[PDB]
Structure formats: structure tokens, C-alpha cells
Amino acid sequence: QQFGRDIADTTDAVRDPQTLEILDITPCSFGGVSVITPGTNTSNQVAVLY
Amino acid sequence: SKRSPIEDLLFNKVTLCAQKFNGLTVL
Ligand SMILES: *[C@@H]1O[C@H](CO)[C@@H](O[C@@H]2O[C@H](CO)[C@@H](O[C@@H]3O[C@H](CO)[C@@H](O)[C@H](O[C@H]4O[C@H](CO)[C@@H](O)[C@H](O)[C@@H]4O)[C@@H]3O)[C@H](O)[C@H]2NC(C)=O)[C@H](O)[C@H]1NC(C)=O
Ligand SMILES: *[C@@H]1O[C@H](CO)[C@@H](O)[C@H](O)[C@H]1NC(C)=O
């Protein structure tokens, strides 16, 4: 075998064609950014949540 | 665990991946 799949039918493991080694695949850190504010009337400081 | 014997029995029966891909997130 040479490929690697899962239930979702998405490639997640690749065999090295040179040294015959089984690698791994993972998406690199996607997400959403949100801010936290106590109300612009009281102050003007915020915090950031990733 | 801070559950009760009935709660413990319930939580051990609900048992039936999908980490992250194609913009699918679970809050
Ligand atoms: C793909 O082509 C390459 C081109 O030659 C080929 O790589 C080389 O293969 C030879 C044998 O076929 C390797 O020679 C030995 O390989 C063994 C197993 O990997 C190593 O353990 C040996 O080196 C060890 O000992 C050294 C001295 O103690 C250490 O310094 C070293 O770090 C190791 O511990 C020995 O080298 C050769 O290493 C490879 N070359 C590389 C860069 O890996 C390869 O075999 C071809 N692949 C296929 C599937 O045909
Ligand atoms: C902002 O907060 C203060 C707190 O005393 C309040 O008096 C004021 O009315 C607030 N600003 C507005 C626009 O309501």
C-alpha cells in the first residue's frame, strides 16, 4: 500500500517513496478570531481570543 | 467523578475523529 484514508475519504497518511516510511497529514491551525470588550463607554481596552 | 451511580450508568451508555478539515469547527 502507498496511500492513507479515513472514514471521511480524505488523505491523511503518505508512504515515503524514498525511505519507505509512513508520514502523517494535518491541516495547519485555521480558526476564528474574536474580541472581548467591556463597553466603549467605560473604557477602551480589549482582549483577543483565538 | 462527582456523579451518582445512576448518572454514571447513564454516561457509560451514550457512547456510540472529525478533528478539523474544510472549515468545520465545533464550539
Ligand atoms: C533510494 O536511493 C538511495 C540512493 O542510494 C538509497 O539510499 C541509501 O541506501 C543504502 C543502502 O541501500 C544505505 O546504506 C545503509 O543504509 C542503512 C539503512 O538505512 C543505514 O542504516 C546505514 O547507515 C547507518 O550507519 C552509518 C554508519 O554507522 C550511520 O552514519 C547512519 O546514520 C546509519 O545509522 C547505511 O548507510 C544509505 O544509508 C542510503 N542513503 C541514505 C541517504 O539514506 C536508498 O536505499 C534508495 N531507496 C530504495 C527504496 O531503494
Ligand atoms: C457611561 O457610564 C456612565 C457611568 O456613570 C454614565 O453616567 C453615562 O451615562 C454612560 N454613557 C452613556 C452614553 O450613557
Is residue A49 left, alpha or beta, with left meaning phi > 0 and alpha meaning psi from -120 to 50? Answer: beta
Residues on chain A touching B21 (C-beta within 8 angstroms): 8, 10, 27
Ligand nearest to the CA of A17: 1
- Residue B19 sits at the vertex; the CA angle it makes with B13 and B22, to the nearest 5 degrees, is 135
Q: How was this structure determined?
A: cryo-EM
Nearest to B27 by CA among A3, A23, A22, A31: A31
Distances (CA, A) of B12 to A27, B1, B3, B21: 32, 13, 12, 29
